C-alpha cells in the first residue's frame, strides 16, 4: 500500500514514451527505438529485455507488464526517467 498513484504517473510516462504508436504494447523496434537514447546499446540487448519483460510472451510489453517488471527494478526506471 505504501505505493501511491503518483508513482504510476512516472511509470505511465516512461511506458507511454516507449509505446511508439500507443497501442498499449511495445515491440523491440519501439523499445529499442526509445532505448537508442542510451547511445551505447545493441538490438540484441533490447530484444533480450523484452524476452525478460514479456510476461506472456506475445512479443510486446504492456503497461501492466512494464509495471510488474518496473517493480522488480524500480531503481532501474529511475535511470531511464532521467534519460528522457
Ligand atoms: Ca506499440
Ligand atoms: Ca506481452
Swiss-Prot record:
Pfam families hit by this protein: EF-hand_7 (PF13499)
Cross-referenced InterPro entries: EF-hand-dom_pair, EF_Hand_1_Ca_BS, EF_hand_dom, EF_hand_pair_protein_CML-like
SMART domains named in the record: EFh
Domain called EF-hand: residue spans: 6-41, 41-76
Alphabetic keyword roster: Allergen, Calcium, Metal-binding, Repeat
CDD domains: EFh (cd00051)
Positions annotated to bind Ca(2+) 2: 54, 56, 58, 65
Name this polypeptide is given: Polcalcin Bet v 4
Binding, Ca(2+) 1: 19, 21, 23, 25, 30
Endoplasmic reticulum listed as a keyword: no
GO molecular function terms attached to this record: calcium ion binding
Complex and partners: Monomer.
Amino acid at each position: 500500500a505504501d505505493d501511491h498513484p503518483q508513482d504510476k504517473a512516472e511509470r505511465e510516462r516512461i511506458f507511454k514514451r516507449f509505446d511508439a504508436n500507443g497501442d498499449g504494447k511495445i515491440s523491440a523496434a519501439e523499445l529499442g527505438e526509445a532505448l537508442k537514447t542510451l547511445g551505447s546499446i545493441t538490438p540484441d540487448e533490447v530484444k533480450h529485455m523484452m524476452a525478460e519483460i514479456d510476461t506472456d510472451g506475445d512479443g510486446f510489453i504492456s503497461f501492466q507488464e512494464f509495471t510488474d517488471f518496473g517493480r522488480a527494478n524500480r531503481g532501474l526506471l529511475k535511470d531511464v526517467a532521467k534519460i528522457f
